[PDB]
Amino acid sequence: KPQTELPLGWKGKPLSGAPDLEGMRVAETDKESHISIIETKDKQRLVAKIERSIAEGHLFAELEAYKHIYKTAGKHPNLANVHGMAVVPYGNRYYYALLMDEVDGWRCSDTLRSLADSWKQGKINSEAYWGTIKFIAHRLLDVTNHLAKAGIVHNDIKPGNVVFDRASGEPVVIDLGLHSRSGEQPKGFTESFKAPELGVGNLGASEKSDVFLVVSTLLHGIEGFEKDPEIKPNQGLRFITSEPAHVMDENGYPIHRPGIAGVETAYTRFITDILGVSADSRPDSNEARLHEFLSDGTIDEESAKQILKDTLTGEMSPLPTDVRRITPYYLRELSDLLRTHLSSAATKQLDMGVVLSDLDTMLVALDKAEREGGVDKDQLKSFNSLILKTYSVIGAYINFMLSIVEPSLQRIQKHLDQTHSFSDIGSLMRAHKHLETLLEVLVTLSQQGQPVSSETYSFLNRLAEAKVTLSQQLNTLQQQQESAKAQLSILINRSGSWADVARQSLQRFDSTRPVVKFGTEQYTAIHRQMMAAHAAITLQEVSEFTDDMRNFTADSIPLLIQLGRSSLMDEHLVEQREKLRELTTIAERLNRLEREWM
């Protein structure tokens, strides 16, 4: 008789409003502690939070917290609705389990990722997005206030401990396991979200530390900290106002950097006024709700709830698996993985399956790093050398093997279908070296081991066909790059006649520090007249060169598109390409200066 047929019981007297347990059965147990779903005969759907086997009474105290909040502050729609302590069947045993209503929907991380995604795709607008965010913050801060009335501090508010209800669109806080009473030392905490004071010294937990958590939880979701594991929400935002606070993709579109702000706004003031300040200077839950950010951009409560119902009944944006940027730390981490394979090859304990799988992810990481910035060319060449050294150890060392390596061939063949740029030259060379190493392994294992099967033989020729298509493509692009170098050098020669005169004139115009001002036309009139006069002087200084500069950019812009913005094998090409880009910016800014300032 399986566990799905066994009954449940009560450990204490349950709470008033608790259901009858007769008929209830376990349906599944999900993914930490183990949570099982209890299907009732009616199907209300309950959650049973089973105790850890380590058994420090964290679970019984959690019940007593819920109990106490209900008696002192009342129930609250955005807080879990708990019924008591049950005994439930799990893993050939009965265990104690905290019994409560299922919040049927998604966790806060999944909801906010999905909300942000529908906004970027254009399914909802900015009013709706930021309205809904502010709506959530009001609910969470209302709950931290509700707990403060009971004299309970939560201590572990974070994305996993908030769950959204699909039916109502309401966020619900759960997981009081690490709760303390006010001014007692906290039972535990999560380090990425923790407020600085929380857990250190005489003064322990307060409502202030809860308010902090509520914000670090929102910041996490809003900025998308999951995409960048090297930062943690309780450090708040970094400001970059002199340079770009963003990265550019292939096509000139900026991309938000998680944790980086380019200007102070109500939103950045919210983060700084709470996360960037001590407990006594930090607002409590009701003051935080008065903040500019939460006071100003709000939408109707039913409007927000509606948007959240719609997000939750739609498709969940999946967790991004390898969109992580290639930083010196991550690239260091990947080198340490290769260093263990070389370490195990020396000791004759090299898993051949996993080194070829991991080498393929190294290739993708390196191609990714070349497209973006992030790491200097010396850290790349050292990584590249470490790959080549690892291919060196395989050849030197010496149909399950086919299934490991086919994914690698398919990825490369998908890459052979695409339209390439010059930044693909190094990418394709490396890919050729991979296919060659795959070919050598398979053929070599048939010498002293298992003979070649029909699948292997056909695979060898699929690798061989790809190697040649790769060679032809790699050879066309090297020819095209030589045309591009010559075209580059000619364009530079033309610039001689005007470059320095134009660079100087525009440097002087830029030192006046031109800028569109906020305000009325009357208020900005003197300012606008001053710029136009400066702009008129600059265009008079370069009059003789105006046709040259206009014709120069008709040629240079299409060439700069072709040479791209990423690293290239040829380092002289890159230094030259940047000199064209700088000359192009001078010419094109002067070609538009009248339109922009007069």
Binding site: N125, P254, T265, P514, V516, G519, R565, T585
Partner: protein, 358 residues
């Protein structure tokens, strides 16, 4: 004594006296009540108020708040007694008959106006251009309308409405700026982003070519000073924001741009009058104020129309007030003084009368 002309928009209300070159009062169509003020004062005291727009997509939806805007317009902006001046109001194309009666009833019963007329907004912008035949693309804060007009009369079967206008562009600009690390989010910040939009955006004649330029170099970047002194720099956002007018997909809309919406309105008209509509495409409202929009509409409509036809776009310099100027012209005409609905006519026939006279 001078007539009053008021043009009620989704974003802005424009008010003045018949005979003036421009309206004397321009303020936001916003009412704010406790958690009661109108216009800029409602915005300044937003912290203790819940702000609402009584006009949505050109059409009146909150009559209580609309009554407040008119009371504000007369008593605070124009500082006049509505019992002593006749009043010209404006309305959107395809305004429900029920709304027209409610408008009439409020002027006569709440404000005691001696007389009133109501006019279709697009038709006033065509009168303002010196025309009685033409097609109008009116685009404001809440709505865009292509209105073909023949010899004075709008052709309601060929009118198209597009819920894509300035408010949606301001909102889109707020989104795309967050990629540069700029998080504008409050209604105060929304107004600042509207300022940026109005001063930095333009329509590219060739979008893909400007995108290329913006990616190749930094020569389209341009900086803006916020009211607190902070400075931001923006790039392809400048021309990408108003491109949404031609590519509604940028706003998540599965819909035709203004160029193609205009084409379709012309095509719903009789073949015999199309040539004239094509040669008298007039443009109206603040959302048609983008540098480069007139040339783009010329390019884009010439692409869809027969090669025989001559496509001529008219784009008056001060066209955010074209509707109001039309009304000032019309009320000021001597021939028009017969057209007003009088207080006597309303006291004798009730709100229903409006449909007979307008």
């Amino acid at each position: 004594v001078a007539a009053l002309v008021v043009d009620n928009g989704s974003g802005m209300c424009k008010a003045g006296f018949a005979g003036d070159d421009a309206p004397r009062a321009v303020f936001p169509s916003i009412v704010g009540r406790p958690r009661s003020y109108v216009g800029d004062e409602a915005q300044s005291k937003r912290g203790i108020l819940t702000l609402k727009y009584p006009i949505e997509h050109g059409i009146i939806t909150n009559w209580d708040d609309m009554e407040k805007i008119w009371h504000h317009t007369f008593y605070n902006e124009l500082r006049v007694a509505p019992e002593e001046h006749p009043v010209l109001l404006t309305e959107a194309p395809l305004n429900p008959k029920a709304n027209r009666e409610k408008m009439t009833q409020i002027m006569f019963e709440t404000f005691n106006s001696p007389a009133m007329h109501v006019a279709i907004q697009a038709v006033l912008s065509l009168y303002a251009s010196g025309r009685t035949t033409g097609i109008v693309l009116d685009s404001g804060d809440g709505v865009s309308h292509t209105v073909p007009i023949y010899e004075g009369y709008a052709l309601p079967h060929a009118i198209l409405r597009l819920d894509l206008a300035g408010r949606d562009l301001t909102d889109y600009l707020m989104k795309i700026l967050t990629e540069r690390g700029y998080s504008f989010t409050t209604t105060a910040e929304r107004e600042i982003v509207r300022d940026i939009k109005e001063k930095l955006c333009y329509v590219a004649l060739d979008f893909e070519q400007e995108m290329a330029t913006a990616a190749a170099s930094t020569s389209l970047e341009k900086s803006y000073e916020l009211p607190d002194g902070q400075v931001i720099a923006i790039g392809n956002e400048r021309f990408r924001c108003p491109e949404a007018l031609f590519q509604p997909s940028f706003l998540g809309m599965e819909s035709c741009g203004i160029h193609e919406t205009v084409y379709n309105s012309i095509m719903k008209c009789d073949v015999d009058i199309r040539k004239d509509l094509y040669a008298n495409t007039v443009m109206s409202g603040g959302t048609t104020m983008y540098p480069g929009i007139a040339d783009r509409m010329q390019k884009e409509i010439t692409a869809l129309a027969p090669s025989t036809i001559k496509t001529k776009i008219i784009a008056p310099p001060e066209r955010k007030y074209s509707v109001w100027i039309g009304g000032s012209i019309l009320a000021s005409l001597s021939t028009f003084q017969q057209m007003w609905i009088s207080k006597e006519e309303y006291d004798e026939s009730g709100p229903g009368i409006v449909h007979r006279k307008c």
